[PDB]
Amino acid sequence: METQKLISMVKEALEKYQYPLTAKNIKVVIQKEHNVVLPTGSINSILYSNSELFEKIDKTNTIYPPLWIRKN
């Protein structure tokens, strides 16, 4: 259930801004809006592990740290 709360926060960051975001961008967006300091890795875990909810905008293995969008 913690993971589901974070997934909703990640979607929420991504939907608030209409361009791709790095995992660290998403972390700080969640920090400013929900005032919790989360490890950047925990945002990455969500991003990589829910491949039907999030995807990298760069599919050529060049943009690092990767930029992420919602898969929709």
Next chain:
Amino acid sequence: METQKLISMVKEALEKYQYPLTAKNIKVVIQKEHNVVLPTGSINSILYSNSELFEKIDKTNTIYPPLWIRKN
């Protein structure tokens, strides 16, 4: 190596992509097509010191590290 070749490598990097990039993204892009590893802070010097060619896309002091665009 030359101020005026780094301006144009950063500028090329932004122009290759349709979305904002971080300074570190640009670093990795340049390391890819010109095979030179620059410090992340060398790109920031260029980006801030040339406010006519580059601007940040978020102006609410929220997105960090900042996402940069080639200014239209």
Next chain:
Amino acid sequence: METQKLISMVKEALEKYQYPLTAKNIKVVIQKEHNVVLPTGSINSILYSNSELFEKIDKTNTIYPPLWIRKN
């Protein structure tokens, strides 16, 4: 350079050590014995996209950045 040579470099790196490694550890290991500097995020792509060869050792969402093992 090749997806299937990076899988085996990451996989070699884990196998050289008796304990879990981070993605960045693996990066530095590969930079050591194959003299190529990869972005940290390129290793993560491999680790998550090959969940049959690699798994995280902590499953409590606590260890970040995650520690990875060659799956037994």
Next chain:
Amino acid sequence: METQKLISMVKEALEKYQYPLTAKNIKVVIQKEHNVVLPTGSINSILYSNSELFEKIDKTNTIYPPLWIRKN
């Protein structure tokens, strides 16, 4: 007005220590004194954008992450 508050905190960190500081040094100095966790990027933004208040002690494009002093 948020930016003005941060500018005052940055000056305050720099004036408390009588040697140059990195943006991350300044971040943690502000954390310990004012107990707010700010993105390192937001300190950088202040530093780079107020070129008449702050300047890099290294003008040879070598020290990275840059070391900063107050321009005075």
Next chain:
Amino acid sequence: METQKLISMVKEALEKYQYPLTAKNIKVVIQKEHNVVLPTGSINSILYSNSELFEKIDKTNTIYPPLWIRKN
């Protein structure tokens, strides 16, 4: 006395997990358990400065960021 409190927290993180941890792993373990955001450097200081309490599991100067165990 602050340093002694941190030393006890570092030992406590290391003893809670039965594999080596990076300084940033230890930081976030202490964050989750004691809810304080400490600079990663302050964990490193403890680790490097108390060489009879902590040691790197890798003695070949390869694993970076280093992985740490309790010396026992």
Next chain:
Amino acid sequence: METQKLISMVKEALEKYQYPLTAKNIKVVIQKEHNVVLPTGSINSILYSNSELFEKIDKTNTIYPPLWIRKN
């Protein structure tokens, strides 16, 4: 490559500058004049393991990442 050549590269790096440097600063300095990219953690090993040549300038456990000086 040699313990005793890294001691003298770190030591040269500090001596080139009139102010304290971080371990990462030293890394970038060495990458500049000897064209070898070392992991940040390799410099820390040298700095802490040679407490006769190097010391931190802040002794209040505030400046992180620590700023280092050639000991007078």
